[PDB]
Design a protein around this ligand. Structure first.
Ligand SMILES: CCCCCCCCCCCCC/C=C\[C@H](O)[C@H](N)CO
Ligand SMILES: CCCCCCCCCCCCC/C=C\[C@H](O)[C@H](N)CO
Ligand SMILES: [Cl-]
Ligand SMILES: [Cl-]
Ligand code: NA
Ligand code: NA
Ligand code: NA
Ligand code: NA
Ligand code: NA
Ligand code: NA
Ligand code: NA
Ligand code: NA
Ligand code: NA
Ligand code: NA
Ligand code: NA
Ligand code: NA
Lengths: 296, 244, 242, 57, 242, 99, 57, 49, 50, 48
């Protein structure tokens, strides 16, 4: 009734065959007693790195070990323990006089790739899914706390970005906004995972649009819209110039973190936001160097 | 365990000096679940006509070679029926079986690191000083089947250490031990399907960590050939053929 | 209202405090999570993956950076000559800085557990030889000769079909955990020293190279653990990132 | 009851969190299950081998 | 009193925070709710109602605004001539801006689901003809001819007693959701292109008009969904409203 | 002409696969849409001028003075609801004063 | 108990809200039931027809 | 929010007050406690020596 | 407004008011105003000894 | 690069001296008459 290669066919299997399983490991593995072993045929110490797998040799087979009941916790190395720590990811200036946002408002493009510490950590993984907690610390350039009322507004991509302090966009009929005084403790808020993808990508090896990819448009290489969450806008809630110069530091704490595919950790200094460019004339070694290989 | 045969489609690979097989992240390629999918149109699963071994260009290993790389969905977009489907369809999905082969003699020596780096984004030297925001050209980000040579292998041309590249599915070709590396990669992306033209899921890196060497008289031409086969290929969103 | 009394710590913003915060988007539902390969659950999973250890961290030249990834071995004079040496300290400036383990350590103040270093010989099939990799626990000064190095934990490696050998640096410490070792007072937490010696000699026939290289790969054992998060010693940035 | 909109919804891992709002992505990070899969990255070999054996037979 | 400790976020006024507030009128009871027809429970109910799609968004003249609501079709030369073209993108500047769906989209950052466009032929009873409406998924440039357009999703429409035909623009995306597509980088979320071609020709007898019009009505399917509220791109106000 | 939207489904127009759609429809409910505070009034109490210069003002309650909020509600003819009013006060420069 | 004076009193829809005052119109917006009636606006025809049928017979 | 009313003593820092304080290191686990001789439980143990 | 930061041994100690180390991507930090009640925090037993 | 698009086998020299290329029966007809130049080239098997 039906061709055999179609019946016995396996095209369509949606379940991923996994060769490994995640086991409970709340503490470091214990060490078991070991005695001398003088025999042929069994060679724990000999490996073959070509295979691409790490050595499975254990302490017990290399030396005579005692019994150690290891009760050291492995909890502080979970993804949440590692990433759930607020760090600086943005900094906005609202000076009185200058060429940088001198009209009492600013539009910060949401991108946590502007600061090395936070950036290097997250770039340890290729993909990451998480909720976050944003905290906004505001004050003057001297650290002085001033009696000023500010308005922070999240402008998702597509919404109208304010063009002035008195822009109509500040009506926030739908965008989420926060009104705080610099005298109040830093505003804090919870953000969900808002990407149209299943996770954010710190690395996107491709282009966002089709067509010819000429020199002028190489600016778009590695730009993934699934990571472009919109803009963060700030302003003096008023219609006149503020009496003080302001600064807003943005901190981010990740929660409910999932991460996939680890990568080599940043080796060279960061230069730009949208890419991994490095100074070709100042390529420094990963670490420290010495005089001779036979001397410390 | 040193010998092996890989048969898929109408192609068969043989080897008598292998070093087992690596299955990237401990997962075999599979088709897309009905709950992981979004595109509502029924996909095409050409099977045998696209899931077979394609042998791309050969490279010459010199005592001074730095290394090469190939972006993957890409290397095949202009070859066989796989390429045609990748051009006619908007969405593509698939795993790969990569087999890098390179043989010498019991008197030659050297070691190649063969690794798979997902989302392998290329960076530039930034004009040397690091003040110029330059970007890699299309010819370098998506080199095609001819692959591309690394200018600064130590940092993988992306500011990251090659010494840690082993956290990725890899294998070595140590001439005194084996003459090939086999790595099976599942479909990895944050989406169930994606464009085979605009996006390159991963990159294949073949880099000499221990320089090739031999005494004058032994054959000096030592090639490195790349053979690869798609697995569980699925395409959707049919239209006219698009090259890029 | 209900009688309350705010205590010290009121209004403070503790970077690591794990509390609740008002959600900005009511009834928002995230994009479903597809299945993605290579998911990580704990960083210790990465500390067990071997990465190249730069034992030959000597060349700093622009063109010679790729040679820090492997060190030479060759025909000698047969007097148990020294090949290479390096501290076993994971979170210390030196060879371990090139490894993933060394990098992840930088993010933790303390660690505990056995370490392992696998050496892969990349010479020719016709090349033979036996090496003696020794690990000298704390207090033991850099062994002056092989006869002194062999008094500590060691392994005699014989080159053959199995290209690699694994030196296990057993956890031999006085304290349950070790903080990162540095020069001076914190050298209290030193792990010891590793040194490769020629057990016999690198032998080869006519027609085969007189010099071959060894590649060292390092990682942690199953009993390895880390605690007390901190920032890495280095920040890869000089001026603002544009 | 409460909205199930946290980033870890439908994960093969258990969490103990605290919350005061209807949206669960506002909950604390909480404690989590300590499962690990080293082999996924350290031993992703097709045909597993013992430590007592000679890797290449 | 009871020991408390205020955290960051204290005193802030979050526009979207859903909390409790003191009632101004104690024991106040609202006017009973009579039964009123046409109650709405979810905005998606409106996204499924077809509204006129301004495919002919060309005339800007003061007197010619009513003609953007329909586009012409007439006797041709029989070479599969192109009739009309437009992007299928719902929340993008263009034809969809005249629809209720396009307007409601403006209030959400992302959407997902199949769309549908119904074309109603308003020619005379004696007029006949067959058209080919094609939908070209992403990547496919605007088809140069019918032979190229027919390679994508399409439907051959035959004029008859049933005046209309429905072109379903199936949800064919790489991502689960699409953010609004704009020129440049966000063109990543483009849906594709729609193009009407003459399958055969607009045929008519003597005495019947040589030109007739088609009215396109667009809406969403049952699997259409939107998420992440935001403000529409436009604010219908210039100065203060008096 | 009937006045009803097309009931044609994807399945009958093209060969479709099976997709288990678990995308929520919660964010498009009326409460999700309208339960977001927006500006509806603005009152000035200047020191010198012709607009409420005597230290008091009477604002006629009407949410129809601002376009954003107004356009949304005018999507429906009738609406029944409770509301939460928030009053943000400060000087014209945004300065917080002890008043 | 508590005053039943919210705008949604006597509605064929269930709500999960929080409150601290005696007047229920002070309660949070809460979560709600996700029922829908597309046909009310999209297919308000007297004599319903199938999609397989020719609308005008 | 929930109606509250702060009383006198608010914000004061009482040296001997035994309250709760935010932990600086989440999920941190201290070094196991080995057995050590001469453990003291109460100072009165010393007043008798 | 002040910033207190705990720098465990091995972490980079700030060399200036604008040091990059103040990013506290991993170190625990506390931001307080002198007008707020004294900052208070809990610390565990963090010695590698018992 | 063109030959590899058909049925093939990559042969690695080693202890096992030989390798077998199987020329699978891929025909339109159930049987093939002897192929000659000209019209009967209709029954050609292919090329190795
Ligand atoms: C007053 C309300 C303010 C609300 C602010 C909400 C901010 C939400 C930010 C989500 C940020 C996700 C960042 C993820 C990825 C990076 O953008 C990309 N890797 C940059 O290339
Ligand atoms: C200090 C207590 C202040 C209390 C303020 C209570 C304000 C209650 C406002 C109810 C506003 C209902 C607005 C509804 C409709 C608009 O007025 C009309 N569409 C205008 O034509
Ligand atoms: Cl150390
Ligand atoms: Cl759109
Ligand atoms: Na799957
Ligand atoms: Na072994
Ligand atoms: Na191991
Ligand atoms: Na244990
Ligand atoms: Na403006
Ligand atoms: Na009271
Ligand atoms: Na309130
Ligand atoms: Na419909
Ligand atoms: Na469903
Ligand atoms: Na019908
Ligand atoms: Na009191
Ligand atoms: Na500094």
């Amino acid at each position: 009734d039906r061709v055999a290669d179609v019946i016995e066919s396996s095209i369509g299997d949606s379940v991923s065959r996994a060769l490994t399983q995640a086991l409970p490991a709340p503490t470091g593995q214990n060490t078991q007693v070991s005695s001398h072993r003088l025999d042929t045929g069994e060679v724990p110490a000999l490996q073959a790195a070509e295979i691409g797998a790490s050595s499975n040799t254990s302490d017990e087979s290399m030396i005579e070990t005692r019994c150690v009941l290891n009760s050291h916790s492995t909890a502080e190395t979970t993804l949440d323990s590692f990433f759930s720590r607020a760090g600086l990811v943005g900094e906005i200036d609202l000076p009185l006089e200058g060429t940088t946002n001198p009209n009492g408002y600013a539009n910060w493009d949401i991108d946590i790739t502007g600061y090395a510490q936070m950036r290097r950590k997250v770039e340890l993984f290729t993909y990451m899914r998480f909720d976050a907690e944003f905290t906004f610390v505001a004050c003057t350039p001297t650290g002085q706390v001033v009696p000023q009322l500010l308005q922070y507004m999240f402008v998702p991509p597509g919404a109208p970005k304010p063009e002035s302090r008195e822009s109509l966009a500040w009506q926030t009929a739908t965008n989420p906004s926060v009104f705080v005084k610099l005298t109040d403790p830093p505003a804090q808020v919870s953000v969900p995972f808002m990407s149209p993808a299943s996770a954010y990508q710190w690395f996107y090896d491709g282009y966002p649009t089709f067509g010819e990819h000429k020199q002028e448009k190489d600016l778009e290489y590695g730009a993934c819209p699934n990571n472009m969450m919109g803009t963060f806008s700030v302003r003096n809630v008023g219609s006149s110039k503020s009496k003080y110069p302001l600064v807003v530091r943005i901190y981010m704490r990740m929660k409910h973190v999932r991460a996939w595919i680890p990568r080599p950790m940043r080796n060279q200094n960061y230069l730009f936001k949208a890419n991994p460019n490095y100074a070709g004339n100042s390529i420094k070694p990963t670490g420290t160097s010495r005089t001779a290989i036979t001397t410390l | 365990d040193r010998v092996a045969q890989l048969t898929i489609g109408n192609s068969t690979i043989t080897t008598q000096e292998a070093a087992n097989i690596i299955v990237g992240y401990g997962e075999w390629p599979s088709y897309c679940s009905d709950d992981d999918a979004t595109a509502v149109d029924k996909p095409t699963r050409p099977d045998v006509s696209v899931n077979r071994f394609y042998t791309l260009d050969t490279k010459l290993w010199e005592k001074s070679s730095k290394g090469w790389y190939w972006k993957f969905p890409d290397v095949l977009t202009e070859t066989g029926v796989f390429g045609q489907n990748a051009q006619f369809h908007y969405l593509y999905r698939s795993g790969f079986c990569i087999h890098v082969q390179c043989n010498a003699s019991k008197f030659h020596q050297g070691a190649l690191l063969v690794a798979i780096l997902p989302e392998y984004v290329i960076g530039t030297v930034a004009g040397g000083t690091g003040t110029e925001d330059s970007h890699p050209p299309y010819k370098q980000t998506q080199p095609g089947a001819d692959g591309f040579e690394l200018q600064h292998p130590y940092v993988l041309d992306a500011g990251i250490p090659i010494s840690q590249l082993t956290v990725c599915p890899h294998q070595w070709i140590n001439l005194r031990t084996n003459n090939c590396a086999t790595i099976i990669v599942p479909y990895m992306n944050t989406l169930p399907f994606d464009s085979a033209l605009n996006h390159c899921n991963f990159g294949l890196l073949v880099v000499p960590i221990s320089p090739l060497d031999f005494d004058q008289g032994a054959t000096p031409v030592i090639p490195i050939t790349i053979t690869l086969a798609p697995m569980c290929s699925e395409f959707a969103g049919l239209r006219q053929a698009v090259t890029q | 209202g209900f009688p309350t009394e705010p205590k010290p710590g009121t209004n403070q913003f503790l970077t690591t405090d794990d509390g609740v915060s008002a959600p900005i988007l009511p009834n928002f539902h995230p994009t479903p999570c597809i299945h993605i390969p290579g998911e990580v659950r704990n960083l210790l999973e990465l500390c067990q993956v071997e990465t190249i250890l730069e034992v030959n961290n000597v060349p700093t030249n622009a063109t010679s950076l790729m040679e820090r990834l492997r060190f030479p071995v060759s025909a000698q004079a047969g007097k148990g000559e020294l090949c290479a040496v390096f501290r076993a300290d994971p979170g210390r400036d030196g060879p371990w800085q090139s490894t993933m383990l060394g990098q992840l350590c930088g993010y933790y103040t303390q660690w505990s557990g056995s370490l392992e270093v696998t050496f892969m010989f990349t010479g020719s099939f016709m090349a033979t030889g036996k090496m003696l990799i020794a690990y000298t626990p704390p207090g033991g000064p850099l062994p002056k000769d092989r006869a002194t190095a062999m008094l500590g934990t060691h392994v005699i490696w014989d080159f053959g079909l199995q290209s690699s050998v694994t030196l296990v640096i057993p956890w031999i410490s006085n304290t349950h955990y070790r903080a990162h070792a540095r020069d001076g007072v914190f050298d209290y937490y030193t792990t010891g020293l590793v040194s490769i010696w020629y057990q016999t000699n690198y032998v080869v026939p006519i027609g085969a190279p007189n010099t071959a290289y060894i590649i060292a790969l390092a990682a942690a054992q199953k009993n390895f653990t880390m605690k007390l998060c901190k920032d890495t010693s280095h920040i890869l940035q000089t001026a603002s990132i544009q | 009851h409460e909205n199930s909109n946290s980033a870890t919804e439908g994960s093969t891992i258990n969490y103990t969190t605290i919350n005061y709002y209807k949206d669960s992505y506002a909950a604390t990070a909480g404690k989590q299950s300590l499962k690990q899969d080293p082999d996924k990255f350290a031993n992703p070999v097709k045909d597993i081998f013992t430590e007592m054996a000679a890797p290449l037979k």
